[PDB]
Write a protein that binds this ligand. Sequence first.
Ligand code: Q55
Length: 331
Amino acid sequence: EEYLVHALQGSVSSGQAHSLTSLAKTWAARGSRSREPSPKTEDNEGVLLTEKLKPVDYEYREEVHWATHQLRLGRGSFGEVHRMEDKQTGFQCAVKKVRLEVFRAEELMACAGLTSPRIVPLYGAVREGPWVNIFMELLEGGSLGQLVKEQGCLPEDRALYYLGQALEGLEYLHSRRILHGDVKADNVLLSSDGSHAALCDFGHAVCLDYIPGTETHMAPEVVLGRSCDAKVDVWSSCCMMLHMLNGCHPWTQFFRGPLCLKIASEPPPVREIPPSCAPLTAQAIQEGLRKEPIHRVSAAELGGKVNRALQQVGGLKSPWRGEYKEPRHPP
Ligand SMILES: COc1ncccc1Nc1nccc(-c2cc(C#N)c3c(c2)[C@](C)(CO)CN3)n1
């Protein structure tokens, strides 16, 4: 590896996942070290994984070889996300710009060279001095977060359909010992017709140390300060399920202050499950929201039960962008 990084450093190349990943570990170490006097010409290095993004004489610099256009897509965990275009190739993609001192190698290690239709493809990452640019496939439908906010809440079949696709992605990750760490509607992206969903933003990922994401979606073992595994993702996937059904995060409509105490102490938020839900839906969420991770179902197991729950309600019938359903009111 140490000869590989030596040969990769100071250049942008077309290459493979392991090359990006090796060089990503070097960036995370640099971010830990104190800032130095910056050179006249910024360090430019990285790996592009697709022919859609072409280095020119082993350089890939913003404004020179590519540019952002229109307004930002949103805020990711550690950086803003923009639409960008390669000026040579004319291919568009998404760029997340992350400060080096905030950059976690797991941003890339968790999704580099993965081939799941349920995980946003990584196109590469390029460093310009203290900035890491992370390139990924552009998905035109926007976030599951935006749809839920727009529609108020999703009908059961639609919620099951997306939860189902998210758990296919988490199974793929979990079998390769990857914890996503921030499973919520905001980090699920939809295709333009809303038929395909994919996990994005691996800012909180760990390769099996867990930086917790949104307090509302955190498993009891995280909050208590106990050591974590892939089961933390299964808990958050059911918190995201309740969010899609109720149009609000779990906990928030009953408790104030830092919720971390309530998550540790209370029974699981199974009371937030709508009474109108199908029996297999209620059961799926119950088994996903077990406080003890050893008894909580796997992503693979919950994926099965959710697929069965979807069949039981009659499959995906509800329209793409239907009518506003009033989110649940506080009691
Ligand atoms: C029209 O396109 C869109 N409009 C609205 C939202 C998202 C998109 N499309 C898109 N395509 C590819 C990637 C991303 C993306 C990556 C990350 C990361 N890492 C990320 C997000 C979007 C957030 C939802 C930004 O708020 C969270 N962190 N988005």
